[PDB]
Write a protein that binds this ligand. Sequence first.
Ligand code: FWF
Ligand code: KAI
Ligand code: KAI
Lengths: 48, 138, 342, 73
Amino acid sequence: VGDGKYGARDADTKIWNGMVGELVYGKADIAIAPLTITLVREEVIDFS
Amino acid sequence: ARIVAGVWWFFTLIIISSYTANLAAFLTVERMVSPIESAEDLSKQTEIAYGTLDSGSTKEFFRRSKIAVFDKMWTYMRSAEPSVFVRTTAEGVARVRKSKGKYAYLLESTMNEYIEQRKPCDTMKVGGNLDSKGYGIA
Amino acid sequence: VVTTILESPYVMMKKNHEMLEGNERYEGYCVDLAAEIAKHCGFKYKLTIVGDGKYGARDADTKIWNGMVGELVYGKADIAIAPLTITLVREEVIDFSKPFMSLGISIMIKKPQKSKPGVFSFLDPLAYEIWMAIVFAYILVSVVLFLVSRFPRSLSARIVAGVWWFFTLIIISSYTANLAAFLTVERMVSPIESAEDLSKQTEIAYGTLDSGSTKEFFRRSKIAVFDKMWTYMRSAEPSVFVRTTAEGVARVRKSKGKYAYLLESTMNEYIEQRKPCDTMKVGGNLDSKGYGIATPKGSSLGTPVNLAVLKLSEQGVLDKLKNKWWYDKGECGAKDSGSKEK
Amino acid sequence: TPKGSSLGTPVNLAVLKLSEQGVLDKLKNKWWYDKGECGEKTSALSLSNVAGVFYILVGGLGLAMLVALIEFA
Ligand SMILES: CC(C)S(=O)(=O)NC[C@H](C)c1ccc(-c2ccc([C@@H](C)CNS(=O)(=O)C(C)C)cc2)cc1
Ligand SMILES: C=C(C)[C@H]1CN[C@H](C(=O)O)[C@H]1CC(=O)O
Ligand SMILES: C=C(C)[C@H]1CN[C@H](C(=O)O)[C@H]1CC(=O)O
């Protein structure tokens, strides 16, 4: 991952960053990593 | 009168035997005691500073929590100097390593179990898990 | 329509359920969780107990699903809220929400101890027959002593004193050393939770439920140990299988301790704290799975109940409910306090 | 294998091969140990050792009686 982040939503810019960001915005097909499952992430993307 | 002294002698014999036995056990097994039992004990005691990563789902877990203990822990961690947050996991573990034992690190059980088995091995996990989550493929 | 099965303490009947009707007659963990899910997703619901009384399975013969899953697939029930273990075969047919509770396969056996030490434990390091024998020997020494005197120079009295002193010396040294052995062996944390330890020993026969995901776990398992244990459970008569969990526990309590019962870590954790505290859990879990709310495939409820379970998990409602129905009402107490007491 | 058989060399190389890749160790540990019966605490007192001590005590008392008898005479 380019930026070196997992994922978060900045309230100011309202843009996702990190692997989650690459996932939502279509820069990556699938995310395999120690990614903690949280509600805010489950709302945007699908967790197995 | 002789029975008083005799029975007293038997009694004290039993007691000293018991003491010697127990002390023998104590010296044989040598079980060290952890400074901090659980997570609540960190909230009850002011002395040892404890911290999480700068950005992560853990700090998010602490920021928004309605339970009293975690609310207090987060109210502690928010205002502190110097700031207790660290940028990488390695820096956190190293900060536990150059501590002398005055710093506690809050991290997910996986990385903890992993570091506990890694050289020098000085680090260890204490107390139950604050919450139960899981990793996933996204 | 919410289908569920009666299992403690997931769904239970109230003390007086006769005068009570509707959703108010049932109480339990699953009931509370149901009320919460229904609150967040905002739907009216009616709890109904599944007719056949099974969780779920696919009959090989007729290839029809039964139980909760059965009532779910064919559209007899809108949602199923119960202790349902997520498995491959069940996930293929129906969709599972993110798991609300985590469990594993665990062993339940009879408790070795009566829950506390006593005065008689002082007489433990030296057996009762040794007590009677030492008192007897003492009075023998006494009568010999009297017989010596007849009607600092001597022999008989000297050797009586010496032999008696030597005797009591060796005896009390044995007492001390044996007590040291007792306390040292009491201080040992080890061994705790050895894997496969049951698989080797033939002294204790172990069993699972008649129909469930545990027995099925043993069936399809290619892992050496579990294959061994399944081969053992398959060929053993009288049948080592039980019909209900209650029957299993009652079988362990009446078995004097020569029987082990394999069940889910949750039911084990529950039964362990119930009076009169006959049973305990031994060893780590054999596998890690989780319970989940089951919805039919393509239903509109799936995503809302998923997000609901996640929301309840993050705000810690699930933990509160579990601690409510497990540890908070527990009469036995002990547990972690017992671990500190050991 | 029978003398001059065509299987001699193949079974030889077979035993060697199966030995080098550790199959023999696996089967050995399979049929001997893994399926064995014998794999805490249980510490308890021993009546019979202390009983031996009782024997030396009684010996002392008997010698005491005899010594009394020879002392009186
Ligand atoms: C079918 C299998 C893939 S499995 O059972 O799902 N996973 C196997 C793996 C060993 C495992 C087993 C159990 C769990 C697990 C851990 C915790 C929980 C509860 C506390 C809620 N966790 S949660 O879903 O992340 C929550 C945010 C709602 C539920 C399940 C996570 C992973
Ligand atoms: C190590 C880091 C930064 C990650 C790993 N899992 C958590 C996550 O997925 O957010 C973070 C740990 C934490 O927040 O303490
Ligand atoms: C309670 C029962 C019989 C059910 C519940 N979950 C497992 C299942 O869905 O198969 C079973 C547990 C077990 O078999 O020990």
